[PDB]
């Protein structure tokens, strides 16, 4: 027997190496709780689980912009609720004033009513603010040059949608002049004429109101689709880089078994040459 060289122990050694190895990658996978932890496991599922969780944050924080944009529209459309329910006072006051029961003394009565009615519907429009910024005054009208209003609602670079809202001061309105003179009712014939201009100011804020409307009810439908399409990207993404447990145990348990067997056997075999000293 040779004794020099002990290849059972060479070839028992190599593959104890190589099974301690296995119980090392399957130890990394149980404790990360993820399969896929460096690169060489699965290059394209990694890169394809990163495309993936780049996808699930951007719909997670596309679904808050969207929430955010509904907020911005909802507190525009409360400021515009009071200037509606002021200009109905006004076309009532204007109904009343056109009676010929009234003198002169009468109408300025009504007329301060109407100046402090107006005054206040060009402190909402100068006032109304979201994030210091103004909403009233047409700095995102159709025709503004001053700014816009974009709301991110997806992932990905150019998923954008742009809002509009108009000029609500007393002149958009026609309540105040080029000059500033107030809508006037402080004679018959003008109240008269100011039912008029006052119905086309309703006009104007219920088209506002019906645009807001349509935009807060399509936020509400993405931020719906959001939610879903998150949740499944979710789903694909941990289907492809998260670790199924109970498999992983049986084959940690399977490679720890024969971590053990190897070793036996390698403690065997070195005391195998031990018998030729018999002979000596």
């Known amino acids: 027997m040779i004794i020099n060289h002990n290849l059972a122990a060479i ?11 296995e119980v090392s990658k399957n130890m990394e996978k149980l404790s990360s709780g993820m399969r896929i932890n460096r690169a060489g496991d699965d290059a394209s599922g990694l890169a394809v689980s990163e495309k ?3 996808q699930v944050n951007g719909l997670r924080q596309a679904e808050r912009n969207t929430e955010d944009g509904m907020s911005l529209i909802q507190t525009t459309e409360g400021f515009l609720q009071e200037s509606n329910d002021i200009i109905q006072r006004i076309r009532t006051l204007a109904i009343q004033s056109s009676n010929g029961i009234y003198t002169e003394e ?57 809002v509009f809202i108009a000029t609500m001061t007393a002149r958009s309105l026609n309540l105040k002049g080029q000059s500033g003179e ?8 003008k109240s008269n004429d100011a039912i008029g201009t006052l119905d086309a100011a309703l006009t104007r804020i219920s088209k506002q109101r019906a645009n807001l409307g349509a935009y807060f009810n399509r936020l509400e439908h993405a931020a719906k689709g959001l939610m879903n399409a998150y949740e499944n990207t979710q789903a694909s993404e941990s289907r492809i880089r998260d670790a199924d447990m109970a498999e992983e145990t049986v084959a940690f348990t399977k490679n720890q078994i024969l971590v053990q067997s190897g070793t ?3 403690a065997q075999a070195n005391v195998r040459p031990q018998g030729v000293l018999s002979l000596l």
Not at 11 to 21: D, W, Y
């Open 11 to 21: 070839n028992s050694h190599r593959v104890l190496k190589f099974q301690n190895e």
């Open 52 to 54: 993936m969780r780049t």
């Open 106 to 162: 009468d109408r300025q009565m009504i007329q301060v009513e109407v100046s402090q009615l107006i005054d206040e519907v060009d402190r909402i429009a100068s006032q109304a603010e979201f994030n210091k910024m103004n909403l009233l005054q047409g700095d995102f009208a159709r025709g503004s040059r001053a700014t816009s209003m974009w709301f991110h609602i997806g992932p990905n670079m150019h998923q954008r949608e742009r």
């Open 182 to 189: 107030l809508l006037s009712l402080s004679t018959a014939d």
């Open 264 to 266: 036996a056997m390698l």
